[PDB]
Design a protein around this ligand. Structure first.
Ligand SMILES: *[C@@H]1O[C@H](CO)[C@@H](O)[C@H](O)[C@H]1NC(C)=O
Lengths: 145, 51, 191, 165, 48, 120, 49, 49, 189, 132, 91, 48, 137
């Protein structure tokens, strides 16, 4: 057979930068892919250089009447001191929930075994699962036995 | 004439752990440090051989 | 003068996807083609005790962008980025593989996934055990330059290519051309 | 801490043989959260002086295991001691020599009952007496857990054995 | 179900927030590589 | 388990290895290489002196200087402990390396794997 | 037997935390180190003529 | 494990074990060196028939 | 055995307070030569003593350079004990670290090695020096067995499963690999 | 054997890594934790380049008996398949054993005149190029 | 737990804790006639309305807890059959 | 294959020994200390 | 015949203002093999300097500065029954403790190996690069 080494054309024209970390997005397209166990490639795909910020950076989202967590996942204030994975990310705030009344979690112990695998991302061209996207470990206070 | 020779060598090694020693800022034993302090700056085969 | 030749090669590759019990069915394939009933029941109990969430339906991931700073703009840009990701390394770029092999793209390298009981560089050797009908199927070509948004329609025009139907296999299934509505910068960034 | 009267004139020789654990009434974490995964537990009794050599067979993930223990005598006929945080007091109060056996175990100020039988099925009168005793032992009916009636291990191997003794 | 205020994961939400306002294929490419292209809506979990 | 030949002893062998793990193999570096990596700082003079002393020690107490039979030089006594024959004191082609010659710089050897030339 | 005193120790107890069972031993200052390498092997041979 | 015994033994001279900075440490050390040198050559199989 | 003459006496040391001399080993016992009980090393008493770190802190008798943040911390860094002495009004946290056991075998890793005799020399590294650091690695040998008859609970080696890493050790990197290779070659002629 | 389930559930406690997705070390150094982030990252990238050039493992002498050279510090050991003993594995109980070809060290880059690397297979790839 | 948040006193509606009906949630799901897979959950099968109504199965002494959404529960288990046989011979 | 592992994409906590060693790293290009760092902690880390 | 040989000493670099030291190094040219003479000396040299140049050695921290490790741990992780600021510099002078799990969940099986650095060029494992400590869902 005839081996084929990769050969990419020049990168696409320059783009704008507005993330306060100005870096010209210069993407390229590999016009010829490798085959028959040849050389995969030599050069990197992306190239980030100096850029002139023109548009203003987007400010953070408004956390209105919501208890802010260590990450920033703003949820309703009713979840404070619920005796469970309220924020579902970390237990930073915790509302100093020492006296947890109203029977937290109603003695429900075990969740589904690996529901995180179903909640995890999925790729179609590779057939391999990806990272978790939907946080199913949360409960919202409504215990469903 | 008949000759038969066999070498049935079976070597088995089970790696319990793989350790790596640090390279910088190594704290030596007090005895070795004393011995190093007891070495003169002039070349002396006896003390160095003892060490 | 008498000469006799004996040659018999039997190989098995069980796939038991029961975390610990998965290896039992794979190891039991040595000299035992038929699966053990008790071992099969144990593996079934293990699979009951541990889910296999694979084989489920999918949805566009970019739809989950609901409440974030610049939510709609980020969702539209993720739409465009997913389109570019899908068409930048689509299997159309790779050359067709021999013996009906399926090609994939891992970075900047094509890989001809060979059918079972086959091997080789481009799935050419080991055609002893096919167990299939045979032939050469059709493969969709890479999408051409997108439409210039004359009236909003699309101009993909996916047509046949260098792997035509030759061995009597079925042609590439799907639409020949596509039609949509140009976003017009997504309604000038949402009104 | 409680103490009752053991079986009158308990004979370890006539008590030897193969026993089958049927029901256990107590309040333990493994019994209440992991009680649904209980399996068939059989017992082997062998006299050794005043003490009692004890072997236990149970299916763990399919593979059987042999738990060998030695119930040390407490100086009183009927009561025994076993050592591992805690002290175990084995007390046999009501039992015959042919059909059933009831054992009492104490650990960390907590009482527990164990029902043993020579073979299946278990007589309804024996189960009624066991229920009456476990109710008189300040234990509720919900704390009773039934075990499967099949899947008992024949014998373990040298590699799969316990050495508590 | 898909349509709701589904509680997103901390890394997912963080990477979605770190995306620049202006169109930049660089960050979105790494995001699509790390997280994939689709998420599950419904279906059984039968083994193979 | 050494005299044993069955896999029944492998479980107890692994258990003993868990309790008392022996050292199978290990990488090594000269003793004067660790003095440079001390908190005391520069020790170039002492390091070179100890390096020369070690170079002389590896020659005065070399395995060749010991009596030919595996020759093991320990202190002032020469032993091989056998030649697997158990015939005589040393348990008597064979092959034997000659010792390193004096620094000329040249350095000669004679009989054979290994190097026979060294330069100071 | 021992020609010297092997019980005296200089300062802070140097731990010898090793062995088959869970027990802590001491190492005297007279001895540099005492490892617990529990090696074991055997040999065999046969001769005929 | 209850009562072991020696298998391998590293060698070391006694005159090297003499305490330093004693009354006559050096001369007594050299004297014991000469004494052991004469001892190991005084009587042995080499001198017998 | 042939031994050279005694070398000249070196200069006396104030702290060592001893003299030193040595000789070279010319020819050992090759086949049947008379062995030499005499060694190549010697020492001598001396009475010519004259005068006997600079960092934050230093041990009294040993020249171990220690920082002041390790003084009065509930851990003996000097063999003499000059770091935990007179610490009257000083709180000493337990760190929940001295309760766990160090890695078994640090003694052999702290010993020297001689390629000539393949034997173990004296201690080179300090196997008991922590320097206030508390690193714990998931033990691999805490997996023997654990049973509970009263609750019919059979579980794993969860009791006392932690190995404290003795500053001088970079990492222990627990791992496991067992490769049994049998090389059998039966020949018949 | 029949204890495959025991090996499987023991691996659940102490598993071994097979597939790895690597990420350079200078990306792990963040600006919020260390000052001079840009200079540190540039120096780390240059050091990684020099290291990859140094430990490329091609500078070791070619082994024999289809061995695979392995670089470790200053020593180089040859990993040989079953059937060969001794250093460099020149002794074996087999005739005309097929020796697999190995690639040599890639040449240095040209000064912006068109970067190309050369290498001789004395089955590794070669003829790598980078635009200036 | 909004109703039972800070109740100073409660009236025991059921004397003993009973187990729920197994697979009772399958009869609360919605049914999409077009899709052939019925639907996700729409009705709640854990709510009981306070009344501790139960039913005793055959040789299943431990009582089951009937939800409030189920008006009538009956245990009439009975099997209901296909058989195929083919044989060909050639000589 | 027993378990799937994935490191957080950003905002991770660094080890204290590596923290101190990076704080000890110089600013001027010195291949010695960087090579020692590569020999002590490797060339990459584990993301997946 | 192929004994180890290191290149010549590199040119002296400028004295680092922050590290108050100058550095020089050498790189390997030929590896030793067949029990040859290795390169049994340091591949780098360090010397003391007298640098007068303002350096930004110390880094700022918003949260509480840990007493032993010097970590920028937020106050939300203090007095929670967890060991966050290092060995024991956290949990100091705490009135009450909370926010800890009751079942005392252990760490992931084998997570220690997945937190250490790896050498992709030699496939060897190295020291820990990530902090896989406890820090509860
Ligand atoms: C369904 O429930 C009804 C309730 O009366 C019962 O009569 C019937 O036997 C059950 N089973 C069926 C209809 O298959």
């Amino acid at each position: 057979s005839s081996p084929v080494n990769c050969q990419w054309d020049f990168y696409a024209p320059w783009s704008e930068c507005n993330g306060c970390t100005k870096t010209q997005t210069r993407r390229r397209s590999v016009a010829v892919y490798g085959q028959y166990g040849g050389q995969p490639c030599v050069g990197n795909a992306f190239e980030t250089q100096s850029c002139e910020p023109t548009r203003g950076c987007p400010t953070e989202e408004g956390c209105g009447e919501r208890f802010r967590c260590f990450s920033g996942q703003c949820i309703s204030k009713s979840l404070v001191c619920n005796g469970d994975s309220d924020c579902d990310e970390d237990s930073a705030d915790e509302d100093r929930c020492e006296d947890s009344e109203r029977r937290p979690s109603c003695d429900i112990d075990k969740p589904p075994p690996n529901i995180e695998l179903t909640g995890n991302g999925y790729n179609e061209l590779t057939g391999q699962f990806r990272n978790r996207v939907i946080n199913t470990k949360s409960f919202g206070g409504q215990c469903r036995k | 004439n008949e000759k038969k020779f066999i070498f049935t060598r079976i070597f088995t090694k089970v790696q319990t752990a793989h350790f790596k020693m640090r390279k910088d800022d190594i704290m030596l034993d007090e005895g070795m440090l004393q011995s190093l302090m007891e070495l003169p700056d002039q070349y002396n085969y006896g003390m160095y051989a003892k060490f | 003068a008498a000469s006799g030749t004996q040659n018999n090669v039997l190989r098995g590759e069980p796939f038991i996807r029961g975390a610990g019990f998965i290896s039992g069915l794979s190891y039991l394939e040595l000299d035992n083609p038929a699966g053990n009933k008790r071992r099969y029941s144990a593996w079934a109990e293990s699979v009951t005790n541990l889910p296999q969430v694979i084989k489920q339906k999918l949805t566009p991931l970019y739809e989950l962008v609901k409440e974030v700073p610049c939510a709609s703009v980020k969702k539209l840009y993720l739409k465009w980025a997913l389109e570019e990701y899908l068409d930048e390394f689509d299997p159309c770029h790779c050359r067709p593989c021999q013996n009906g092999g399926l090609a994939t793209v891992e970075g900047t390298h094509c890989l001809c996934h060979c059918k079972p009981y086959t091997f080789g560089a481009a799935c050419e050797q080991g055609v002893l055990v096919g167990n299939q009908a045979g032939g050469v199927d059709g493969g969709w070509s890479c999408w051409s330059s997108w439409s210039p948004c004359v009236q909003g329609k699309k101009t993909r025009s996916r047509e046949c290519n260098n792997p035509p139907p030759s061995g009597g296999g079925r042609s590439c299934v799907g639409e020949t051309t596509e039609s949509t509505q140009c976003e017009d910068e997504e309604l000038e960034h949402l009104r | 801490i409680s103490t009752i009267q053991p079986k009158a004139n308990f004979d370890a020789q006539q008590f030897a043989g193969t026993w089958l654990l049927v029901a256990v009434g107590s309040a333990c974490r493994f019994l209440q959260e992991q009680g649904h995964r209980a399996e068939a537990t059989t017992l082997h009794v062998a006299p050794q002086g005043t003490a009692m050599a004890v072997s236990t067979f149970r299916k763990l993930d399919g593979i059987c295991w042999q738990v060998r223990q030695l119930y040390g005598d407490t100086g009183v006929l009927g009561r025994f001691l076993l050592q591992a945080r805690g002290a175990v007091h084995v007390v046999v109060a009501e039992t015959d020599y042919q059909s059933f056996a009831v054992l009492y175990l104490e650990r960390a100020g907590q009482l527990s009952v164990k029902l043993y039988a020579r073979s299946l099925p278990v007589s309804d009168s024996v189960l009624s007496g066991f229920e009456q005793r476990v109710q008189e032992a300040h234990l509720t009916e919900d704390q009773i857990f039934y075990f499967p009636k099949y899947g008992f291990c024949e014998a373990a191997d040298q590699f799969h054995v316990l050495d508590e003794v | 179900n898909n349509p709701e205020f589904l509680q997103l994961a901390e890394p997912f939400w963080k990477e979605l927030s770190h995306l620049p306002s202006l169109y930049d294929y660089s960050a979105y490419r790494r995001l699509i590589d790390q997280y994939g292209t689709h998420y599950l809506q419904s279906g059984s979990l039968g083994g193979e | 388990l050494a005299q044993n030949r069955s896999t029944i002893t492998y479980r107890s062998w692994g258990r003993s290895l868990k309790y008392n793990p022996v050292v199978i193999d290990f990488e090594m570096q000269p003793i004067h290489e660790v003095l440079r990596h001390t908190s005391l700082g520069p020790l170039e003079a002492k390091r070179q002196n100890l390096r020369r002393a070690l170079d002389q020690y590896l020659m005065e107490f070399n395995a060749c200087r010991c009596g030919p039979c595996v020759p093991i030089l320990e202190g002032t006594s020469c032993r091989c402990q056998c030649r697997l024959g158990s015939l005589g004191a040393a348990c008597e082609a064979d092959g034997s390396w000659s010792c390193w010659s004096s620094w000329s710089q040249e350095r000669r050897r004679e009989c054979c794997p290994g190097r026979k030339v060294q330069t100071q | 037997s021992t020609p010297f005193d092997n019980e005296f120790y200089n300062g802070l107890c140097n731990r010898d935390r090793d062995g088959n069972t869970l027990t802590y031993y001491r190492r005297p200052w007279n001895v540099a180190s005492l490892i617990y390498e529990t090696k074991g092997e055997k040999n065999f041979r046969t001769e005929h003529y | 494990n209850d009562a072991p015994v020696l298998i391998s033994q590293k060698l070391s001279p006694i005159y090297n074990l003499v305490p330093v900075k004693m009354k006559n440490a050096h001369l007594k050390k050299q004297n014991l060196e000469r004494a052991i040198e004469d001892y190991i050559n005084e009587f042995s199989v080499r001198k017998c028939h | 055995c042939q031994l050279s003459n005694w070398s000249e006496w070196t200069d006396c040391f104030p702290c060592q307070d001893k003299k030193y001399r040595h000789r070279s080993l010319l020819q050992p016992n090759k086949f049947g030569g008379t062995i030499c009980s005499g060694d190549i090393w010697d020492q001598a008493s001396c009475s010519s003593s004259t005068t006997c770190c600079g960092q934050d802190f230093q041990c009294k008798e040993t020249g171990r350079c220690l920082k002041r943040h390790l003084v009065c911390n509930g851990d003996q860094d000097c063999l003499d004990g000059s770091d935990e002495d007179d610490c009257e009004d000083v709180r000493a946290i337990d760190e929940d670290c001295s309760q766990y056991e160090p890695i078994p075998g640090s003694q052999k890793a702290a010993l020297g090695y001689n390629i000539l005799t393949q034997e173990d020399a004296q201690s080179v590294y300090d196997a008991s020096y922590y320097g206030g650091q508390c690193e714990t690695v998931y033990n691999g040998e805490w997996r023997e067995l654990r049973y509970d008859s009263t609750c019919e609970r059979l579980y794993y080696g969860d009791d006392e499963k932690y190995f404290r890493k003795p500053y001088n050790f970079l990492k222990y990197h627990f791992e496991a690999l067992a490769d049994t290779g049998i090389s059998s070659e039966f020949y018949d002629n | 054997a029949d204890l495959m389930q025991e090996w499987g559930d023991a691996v659940q406690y102490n598993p071994a890594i097979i597939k790895v997705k690597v990420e350079p070390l200078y990306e792990l150094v963040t600006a919020t934790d260390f000052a001079y982030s840009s200079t540190v990252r540039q120096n780390m990238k240059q050091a990684l380049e020099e290291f990859q050039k140094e430990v490329s493992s091609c500078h070791c002498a070619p082994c024999q008996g289809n061995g695979v050279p392995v670089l470790k510090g200053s020593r180089c050991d040859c990993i040989c398949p079953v059937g060969s003993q001794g250093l460099a594995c020149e002794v074996s109980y087999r005739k005309n054993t097929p020796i697999d070809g190995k690639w040599n060290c890639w040449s240095n880059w040209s000064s912006c005149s068109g970067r190309r690397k050369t290498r001789q297979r004395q089955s590794g790839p070669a003829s790598e190029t980078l635009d200036c | 737990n909004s109703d039972e948040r800070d109740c100073g006193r409660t009236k025991a509606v059921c004397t003993r804790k009973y187990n729920p009906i197994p697979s009772v949630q399958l009869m609360g799901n919605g049914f999409h006639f077009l899709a052939g897979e019925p639907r996700g959950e729409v009705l709640d099968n854990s709510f009981t309305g306070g009344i501790c109504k139960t039913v005793k199965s055959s040789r299943t002494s431990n009582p089951y807890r009937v939800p409030a959404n189920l008006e009538n529960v009956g245990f009439e288990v009975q099997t209901a059959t296909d058989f195929y046989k083919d044989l060909t011979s050639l000589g | 294959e027993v378990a799937h592992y994935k490191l957080k994409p950003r905002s991770l906590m660094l080890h204290y020994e590596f923290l101190q060693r990076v704080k000890r790293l110089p600013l001027e290009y010195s291949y010695g200390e960087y090579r020692d760092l590569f020999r002590d902690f490797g060339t990459h880390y584990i993301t997946e | 015949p192929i004994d180890c040989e290191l290149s010549s000493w590199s040119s002296w670099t400028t004295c680092d203002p922050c590290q108050k030291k100058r550095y020089r190094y050498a790189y390997l040219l030929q590896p030793s093999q067949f029990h040859g003479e290795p390169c049994n000396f340091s591949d780098k040299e360090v010397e003391d300097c007298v640098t007068n140049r303002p350096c930004r050695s110390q880094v700022r921290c918003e949260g509480f500065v840990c007493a032993q490790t010097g970590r920028c741990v937020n106050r939300r992780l203090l007095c929670n029954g967890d060991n966050d600021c290092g060995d024991q510099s956290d949990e100091a002078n705490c009135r009450r403790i909370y926010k800890k799990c009751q079942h005392e969940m252990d760490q992931y099986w084998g997570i220690g190996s997945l937190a250490s650095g790896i050498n992709l060029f030699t496939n060897s494992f190295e020291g820990p690069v990530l902090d896989h400590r406890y820090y509860c869902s």
